[PDB]
Design a protein around this ligand. Structure first.
Ligand SMILES: Nc1ncnc2c1ncn2[C@@H]1O[C@H](COP(=O)(O)OP(=O)(O)O)[C@@H](O)[C@H]1O
Ligand SMILES: Nc1ncnc2c1ncn2[C@@H]1O[C@H](COP(=O)(O)OP(=O)(O)O)[C@@H](O)[C@H]1O
Ligand SMILES: Nc1ncnc2c1ncn2[C@@H]1O[C@H](COP(=O)(O)OP(=O)(O)O)[C@@H](O)[C@H]1O
Ligand SMILES: [Mg+2]
Ligand SMILES: [Mg+2]
Ligand SMILES: [Mg+2]
Lengths: 371, 371, 371
């Protein structure tokens, strides 16, 4: 049969079929409900909206994310999103297809236990499997050795792998990702008199961040350049026709990744996190780890982030080591591509958690069979 | 059965049957009583006259409007007018027909409470409903999204609606409409030596306003043109054969809608009111609101008012927005047409306030069931 | 010398001298201009009126607030108000006194830049400083640890402080305050047939709100009590002798603070805002924050608001935490009292921005020296 690969991220849902080169369905992972009163009768109105239909009508809706920091917090909305993905986007029968799901490392066990329970009971899938997103990203690049830096909307994490072996004690997890950057940009936009307070306005700020933000190679030099002249300013048109102009915010927003103290976090930056993850591994594999830094996720798509990470890691690493950052242009879907590749492999077909095994063992079997 | 749609405006009464394309009965909402002494015996004389019979004999009558600024102030005369509408104009049995009534937004609650009480007790209707006039106007145009500018004889108001959802906090209400314009024209006609002081003469001034007034595209240029020559002057024949000539008054009278300060009001014009109502809505629906400005009411029938409103809103709106004014030729009866359409809908048949519900709950049920 | 403390709020101006226990001058921050025509010659008439003189003659004036939502929007009127405060109220020479000014957090930078420029150029003050209002309120209570809820006429904001250290990432700002409540009461007064439309009538509605509104401990029980009987009704006399009676509106008006959806806002209430601000701080300071909730501003003077906030925060906080609301009877002037205390401190005398520093650095120095 044909397996289903579903990457349930905090911000976007990636779904498709195993063997394909790109995900079939990509849409935001949101559920919207009306907050005003309906005075017009005879027209089709629904109590909830999911995905693009919620984005289109966001002006009269309150938008909620069921997944927060890679943890599912509203299982009703998550089930609604899964139903939407299975029926309206891919248009498939769930019980006729094994499904591969993704999860961030160091997550609560109950999250994947409930994922398995929902998949086996509500949708009655024949088989399912839960994988780590960082390993799938390594699969997508055709590599067996390297350290993967994956940063999406909720979670940023590092996983070092050498010759197909993972070192769990060196796994790092950070709760700073895209959504936090969007909130910080939303806060700092008030310096120029721009006020965004609603969940519909938050999406507008996210679009502005995606379309106008970049990572500066040197932060203080960029600050001086922005203070000296107006060559770095850009204009953006709001949906109602208003035009806003932003200056140093464009690179101030992504700077939080390297300086988490901008949002009040004591943790270190992504470069120092990667260096510490490398230094926790055996001395005989650090040289290979230094040359196989793999980037994945939407938050790694800022212009100039790879050069900045290269510079920082070079400044941290010994001068005789060769630092190489791997940033494929398609790294936005590396997790899904690796999941499809894994589901297409012949040797993986006996690693599926089947319905019989679940009926015998309960939801706890995902701990024994998956990682 | 067949539902009855009655639009009780400040100036005119519109009545008919649901499913019809036009109101069956249209007549002024006035009650007249003699003010001289009857010296002739043996002839049929009545203590009161309603509607067209009052208009025909206005020379010996004092005319009173029971509705003032969309608020009923004389319930005895209002009951007389309702009896006239039910029995002499439509010629129907009130207890055999559900009745749909209209009301302006931001009205006193006691007004509709007494309307419901009168309908259920005096006329013993089986069911009744009170709708908002601007919503019905939106129904008449076959739209679910737009901002409605309704201006009749007593009230001018704006109601923005998006995807069938109303935003009550953005609803505007103005107490400048046709009657105020008639009074202002009555006052300014004294500059040419014309004196109208009675309620019968006020009707003559209203006819003059309806037949000779228009909205100037640019007020000061029209002023200069009227001062330069006499190309804008028109002649009107009084009922007794006298002929009057008016110049700049023709467009001075409707100018009060855009400059309320002409009658001593501090409020802004209709264009600024519409712009402020649009700006109070969510940023993601303002573009659709800009292109769906719907006009309704008799006061919107001045020649050239739509172009003036388009110009003003374009001058107020951002240059990249598309401003479109919708002014149907039948907008004089948009409220009644929308009411008939709503009463003809199948899904509305369970929204009627029935006699049993009124007997159970009292007059206050109209607040819970209607809007 | 003697420093000047000026608290420029959206609704009122508080001014005086450092070291005093109360502000010397309190008057509304309004500028009024005549809207009728002057027909009497030989009498003293002015083109503008400021403060109490504008309030006294409001019947023939249009009233404008130069400050909107803590942001100065009319700098000419603001300069007129500053001139009035300096010369007619305090009767002092501006160049002989350093001046301390206040501002709300998360404000546009250009606002304080222009404030500094106006103070240094137009009035030629020797030194000036801009402080955050919530910090000054904490100064007034003799505390170094606590979370301050300040709500005036334009802005409501929360600032948590622990051991003299502020956590900027946990600062909350809300654009719902007294003026919005006045507008909502103005809108809901139409349910009883009372119509207030002018800026002079808006002041009357504000007086009614100040004199008759209170916060209900339980909203639905108060609704049921008001519906059952008339024990909650009060009477108010209009300036022309008319008497109005209001029922549930008295506590419906302040309820918008806890339910912003009454005016169409998606944001949460003040209690939930305070709880979220507390939860964003470090876990080791939340216990001290829970017991030091400080109220400040005119909008916190509603009867029963402190008990309602205590109940809500207790319902939100863990059952083992001790919730304490600090509501001094003089919290109406807490910002000014704290500003005077700060200006009287010996260690603050070197934090003044002096004329030499401004001449060297330009208006941008307020960003580097102030917070
Ligand atoms: N061009 C871009 N520049 C910066 N950030 C981006 C860009 N495109 C997407 N993002 C951000 O990436 C995040 C979503 O990416 P994704 O890896 O799909 O996250 P998740 O897997 O958590 O859904 C969002 O926060 C989005 O704003
Ligand atoms: N052709 C016209 N030009 C200008 N005003 C008109 C015209 N026809 C009617 N009116 C005015 O419209 C008002 C009544 O219209 P209508 O919408 O029926 O009001 P209502 O619903 O309050 O009775 C009256 O003031 C009348 O003078
Ligand atoms: N007793 C009261 N009850 C309720 N509101 C009040 C009371 N006294 C003053 N206010 C309101 O407080 C606001 C002004 O207080 P203030 O803290 O001086 O604001 P600002 O600093 O913005 O001028 C006004 O909206 C006023 O109506
Ligand atoms: Mg992801
Ligand atoms: Mg009408
Ligand atoms: Mg204040």
């Amino acid at each position: 049969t044909t397996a289903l690969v579903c990457d349930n991220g905090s911000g976007l849902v990636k779904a498709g079929f195993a063997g394909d080169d790109a995900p079939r369905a990509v849409f935001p992972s949101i559920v919207g409900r009306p907050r005003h009163q309906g005075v017009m009768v005879g027209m089709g109105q629904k109590d909830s909206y999911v995905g693009d239909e919620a984005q289109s009508k966001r002006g009269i809706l309150t938008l909620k994310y069921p997944i927060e920091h890679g943890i599912i917090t509203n299982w009703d909305d998550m089930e609604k999103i899964w139903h939407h993905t299975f029926y309206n986007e891919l248009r498939v029968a769930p019980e006729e297809h094994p499904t591969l799901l993704t999860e961030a490392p160091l997550n609560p066990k109950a999250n994947r236990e409930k994922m398995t329970q929902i998949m086996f009971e509500t949708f009655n899938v024949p088989a399912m499997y839960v994988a780590i997103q960082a390993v799938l990203s390594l699969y997508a690049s055709g590599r067996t050795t390297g350290i993967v830096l994956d940063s999406g909307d909720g979670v940023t994490h590092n996983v070092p792998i050498y010759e197909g072996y993972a070192l769990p004690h060196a796994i790092m997890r950070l709760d700073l990702a895209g959504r936090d950057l969007t909130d910080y940009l939303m806060k700092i936009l008030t310096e120029r008199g721009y006020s965004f307070v609603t969940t519909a306005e938050r999406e507008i700020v996210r679009d502005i961040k995606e379309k106008l933000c970049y990572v500066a190679l040197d932060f203080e030099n960029e600050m001086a350049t922005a203070a000296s002249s107006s060559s770095l300013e850009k204009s953006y048109e709001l949906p109602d026709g208003q035009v806003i102009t932003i200056g140093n915010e464009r690179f101030r927003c992504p700077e939080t990744l390297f300086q988490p103290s901008f949002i009040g976090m004591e943790s270190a930056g992504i470069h120092e996190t990667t260096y510490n993850s490398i230094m926790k591994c055996d001395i005989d594999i650090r040289k290979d780890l230094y040359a196989n830094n793999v980037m994945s996720g939407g938050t790694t798509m800022y212009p100039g982030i790879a050069d900045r990470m290269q510079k920082e890691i070079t400044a941290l690493a010994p001068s005789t080591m060769k630092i190489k950052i791997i940033a494929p242009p398609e790294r936005k879907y590396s997790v899904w591509i690796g999941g499809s590749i894994l589901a297409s492999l012949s040797t993986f077909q006996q690693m599926w958690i089947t319905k019989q095994e679940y009926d015998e063992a309960g939801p706890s079997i995902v701990h024994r069979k998956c990682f």
